[PDB]
Symmetry: none
Subunit: 311 residues, 6 copies
């Protein structure tokens, strides 16, 4: 028993040593790698990620059905990054970016770098060139399924096979260059298309889905969302997050803060009343949310505490 524990700890260390940090973990583990991260815009998701956000210098995949919120998430990541002075690039093969919505989410469109590549290979080569430049902090690719191989664009080989080979031939180099420059790259996808390269090179894989609607009376104002961290090499995987994505607003962060604040016993709740530091902040989640939103500095205080407690 005593010897076994040491034997276990020793074997796990050897694994980590031989195959790399994160190669194996106890799912209940509280420890998490030391890496710089960018918020996803969601507090519950940042917590599910263990590290407090998406890891810099790594590859991340976010996949889910159309209208699941995949794009909202990546825009929220771009917004948070830019807010810190980071340079972001959007590699577009979907031709569907909504700048009006992006601005509402806080994205600095004017300073967002954008590329609309001629082929899937070119898209990947541009991602690699940007990764090597060491002058770009975040790259978002929309999307894997839209990265049509040159051979297909030129019109008898399997389109699936061609896409898989295209992704494979570029992944190792890209991953190395991204790591070296500490650049984060997110692939939006819809097993997912593109083969096994992304699945294995990704440090984080997120499964996002719309699980319901958010209504204010009888009017649909958004969607209830659920994100599962199906792969996580920086912390324990399989945690999930649930939050709302409101139209023209994005992720309802303060709504999350209210709930987490309560769960962490930082915010008291007597019936329909919420209180913080011996003072009512609002009656009803809607009001408590509005309060925090109106009192930014106090919200930050609670968030910092929620993070210190759960991360």
């Amino acid at each position: 028993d005593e010897n076994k524990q040491k034997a276990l700890a020793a074997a796990l260390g050897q694994i980590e040593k031989q195959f790399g940090k994160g190669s194996i973990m106890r799912l209940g583990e509280d420890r998490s790698m030391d890496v710089e991260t960018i918020s996803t815009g969601s507090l519950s998701l940042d917590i599910a990620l263990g590290a407090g956000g998406l890891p810099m210098g790594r590859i991340v995949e976010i996949y889910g059905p159309e209208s699941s919120g995949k794009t909202t998430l990546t825009l929220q990541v771009i917004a948070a990054a830019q807010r810190e002075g980071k340079t972001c690039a959007f590699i577009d093969a979907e031709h569907a970016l909504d700048p009006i919505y992006a601005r509402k989410l806080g994205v600095d469109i004017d300073n967002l770098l954008c590329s609309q590549p001629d082929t899937g290979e070119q898209a990947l080569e541009i991602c690699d060139a940007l990764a090597r430049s060491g002058a770009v902090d975040v790259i978002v690719v929309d999307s894997v399924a839209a990265l049509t191989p040159k051979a297909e664009i030129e019109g008898g080989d399997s389109h699936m096979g061609l896409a898989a080979r295209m992704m494979s031939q570029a992944m190792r180099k890209l991953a190395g260059n991204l790591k070296q420059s500490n650049t984060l790259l997110i692939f939006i996808n819809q097993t997912t298309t593109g083969g096994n390269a992304l699945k294995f090179y990704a440090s984080v894989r997120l499964d996002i889905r719309r699980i319901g609607a958010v209504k204010e009376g009888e009017n649909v104002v958004g969607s209830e969302t659920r994100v599962k961290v199906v792969k996580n090499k920086i912390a324990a995987p399989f945690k999930q997050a649930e939050f709302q994505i409101l139209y023209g607003e994005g992720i309802n962060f303060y709504g999350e803060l209210v709930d987490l604040g309560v769960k962490e016993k930082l915010i008291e709740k007597a019936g329909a009343w919420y209180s913080y530091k011996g003072e009512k902040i609002g009656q009803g989640k809607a009001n408590a949310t509005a309060w925090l939103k109106d009192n930014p500095e106090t919200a930050k205080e609670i968030e910092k505490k929620v993070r210190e407690l759960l991360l």
Copy 2:
């Protein structure tokens, strides 16, 4: 910071150098490629395009639902071109051209070249032959969905797959020939039909939709229209334009000039009164519009200024 900026500018230059001009841009960029362009008939759209119109020698796709204004736009382009002495050709597979409406828009029907091809392949081959002739300045294809592959016309292969292969097998050659002769080619479409060839070979892709009706009392006189530049390789993409398309008249250009003139502080507006150069031009947008329409030379003056300021 100082070094990073240079590193960024350097990397972006290398991208442009290796993959081509327009391969990447800062969305807030004011700079735009040096290319000859033809007006779309809409001032707001010419502005959204960044270059002041559609680029000569390139492929453009305009797609949207039936009755969205797709055809009105292409006719306006033909009209503007012919007005400059350019030769235009209309490749028809829809058999729906309305010459009466076209004339009202200013199209010189008598001098418009027209082809009603026997198959989708033939349509493409004729476009290529015209592109190589170097004697045609603008080609409009109506429409991609109507370009039925010979195999389908002759009546077990996927009709979608066949159309995609038909477009793919002709695109590279067509694009090269169009570029060499500086011929503009617009594909009207309704992701769009035809596969990935057009999507990637296009230098500009326009999403057009009818967003409402225009009424003069209780009578519908036209449609409020919105065009989004979803792809743009000559200038920053994702800009949008809104204008009216009036029955028997076409795009309400002067109505746009009034609004843009005001926004650019070139035309003063006191309540319902509009003034230019210390003189009232009309009370109410309808009158201001009518004024400009009646005073052509002055309108040109304002437009030239609006263009110099926004392009």
Copy 3:
């Protein structure tokens, strides 16, 4: 400029050469292919067709809503043909021919060949057999939508898809045989049903519609009609014709002659009086019309002149 024109003329010639006569035309072109034609019964339509009537040896489609005049037109074509000694056949799948009305239009019912096929395929095979015989000059098929595929008649495949395949599998052969024997074939239809085969194999496609009623006081005596030549491979397309179809009489030819005679300055009109060759022919269109109708030989003189001037 000088060189360009030659370059243009040269390219267009190559197109015509490579893809066939009529593959491309300047809409204002006055030139028209050299083909034998049969009158439609309408002078304005014969003029809109450019060649002076429907082309022998080709496939023609006439489509429009129920009660638009589709059948009246085909009967008028049969009448004109028979009047020249040509043999006509009516392939019927509608079972709605009105012999009383047909006779009033001048159709020689006694000598009209008629077939009421067992299936859509059989109908097409009979058309092909008649086309190969070289003993039939005009074939009218009523109608495409009624040509039910055998599979459907026998009662899970798309009825639309089946009809499209039925038409496709027979069109090439039919077109070749019709061309070889110089037989004209008209398909009456109601995009139209039957798929893309007819749309592309047709040398002429006519869109006919009833745009109003013709009244003599308060009694409806006929319909104002409009025919648009949406496809024309023998002359410039998109021209239109407007005429009246009177009950128990058919197309008001003389009414057209009056108007065209006037437009062509062949018939003078002082107020309500019409004159020809220094003599009043009638006061009021109704009288002028009646005059021409009563003076056949003179009408022919005017028509011959109108044709020489406009064709």
Copy 4:
């Protein structure tokens, strides 16, 4: 006859001696090897296995279609093991573990070791490292088809051939190390993928399939399941088990106990009434099941007896 029997018994002993225990058996044999085992969560399956569960220190393969219950079984094995204080590891290449469902099945997620390997080879090497540590009691690999060879991940060799060679090159070593440390390893699969290595090195191979649904009225609450022991080197093979897998609950163990208890004449059944030790336990299988579930200690008594009688 008398001599033959001895000759037979002697030959079979020599086989067992020369090729190993379990090399040959009389299918009706009641005897079973002496090995430590972990329950599968199903009583009927533990019985079909002959030894009362899956054998420690051996390799086991569980294969079947998607949604057949493969994962439910392995989770049930992990749960039972952990319940005895054993350390379990989950090697994941599918990225689909549902921790909520796992907990419902009794899995101690917090203490479950998890690895999400970079390649199929790495997955196997980690399994071997864990096997040599002697500090892990159960390893589950999900799944064989997802263990993509490095060569394939890196993108012209047969993917099937590569996977087969990958499994082959690691199997002997793994099997020896697992045997030496008495570690059980289960490969989840879907002949199965991976070649012949697993098929021959496995001491037990299970074919699992969903044969129907379980309904409570009109609502589907689970699936009727059937497991066939297609290979068994610890006891006679080809026995089968049938049980229910209920959503959010897992294998319906008590439902099995009821039936087996009855079959073994340990539980009397008069019509719809079930009785044990001269007392009614419930009317209807649903109630009898609920009873046992509520009276844990008594259930154990019956199970112990069923096992002593059938194993």
Copy 5:
């Protein structure tokens, strides 16, 4: 002529003498070697074999596509053997034996010896050990293609070549040992896999195929089967047999008896009525079959007679 015949008979005798019994035969020959045999479960096949069944002490190969009935046949052989008190062994490398179906065919599963070898070589060595024991009467190997050579299991040599060498290196010894102990061994296969050893060492080779389905109304109840004796060293080869294999029942023996009984004029047939010994046994083959099945002793009488007449 007279001398030639003697010369022929003399030469053939010398061949038989020098190369072995069965080395040459006149295909119409009625004579057959004197060897103990086990029924195949099919009367027509036992007849085609000439000796009345498969020969003890010899090697037999049964090959055909998947679902051809190969396994049904070997199970029928095992059943017949066991019914006579013979000991049978099943060497399994396919892991697909269906004990439920086997029992329905009459196989005594409880007393069936079974081995699931670790390698193809081990499988062969176990067959040899059992052959030398002289305590096993019938051995069935399922199947040749599944006997993976150790070298292949361990993962650059031709898999085909390796399998051929594996079979070759074991065949002579096996054949000698089987002959010495009078043990019958059947190899199930799918030219066939395994090289030339089996092809030449086999005394009998059977080609079995499903040639159609057996239906009772509109429900498929079995398969029409055809077996060709492509090699036969105990009697004239190239004879064939046709019979039905019914699901959950096996070979329709009585259906064969009915037909053969009729052909041999042992059973009279007047229209749809069958009679035996001056009494109707049934109207329709289905009834006649059912009769014989219900009157076992009488069936035996007919079979014994059919055999005496045709063997």
Copy 6:
């Protein structure tokens, strides 16, 4: 010139004298050795052979791809021989004889001697024993590629080299014995396998191939066949024959007779009508063929004449 001719004739005679009859020939030579022959079943082939069939006492090789007709030919030879009272033997190493098809070709299966040898060497030794018996007239070996050397059957020497040595070590003796007893031996093969022994010892070598299909409407009823006499020591080589092999019938002899009869001006052909001896035998080759087939005695008359004229 005069002297040269004599010198030539003299030298050629010396060659024939020193090296053997047939050692050299003028390809246009009409003369042919005096040897007994058996028909091939094809009239055109018997003619191409020069001697009217295959030579008794000699070795013949017939090679071609699978399904080329090799077996059909040898069966036709066996049939013709047996029809003359000759004794035939079939040495089988392929185990693929189809007795049903053979009978249709006229083969007397009941009296056909058959051997299915244990090794390639044994096959050859049996052929030699039969050759020495002087009681067998025709021997067919199917096939050379299937005559596996004992060494190979027993499983590091070249399989090709071993087969070549096996054939070589037996050929001289076999050829001498066959010659002495006047026995014909045909080796079926697929340069061909077996080395150089057969190639040089053969008096005739036939290259047979399927060059197309024979259809009766849209149903394939047979194969168009072409046989080239690549080696011929009894008459001039390199002649070819073309005929049809119909399923379930064999070589279309009468179809050949019709054509040859016509070519030899023995059968007149006026358009589609064929006549013989001043009487129509049929309209169309199919009918003329059927006629001859129905009038055996007359066919023989024509064949005898065709042979006298061309042999």
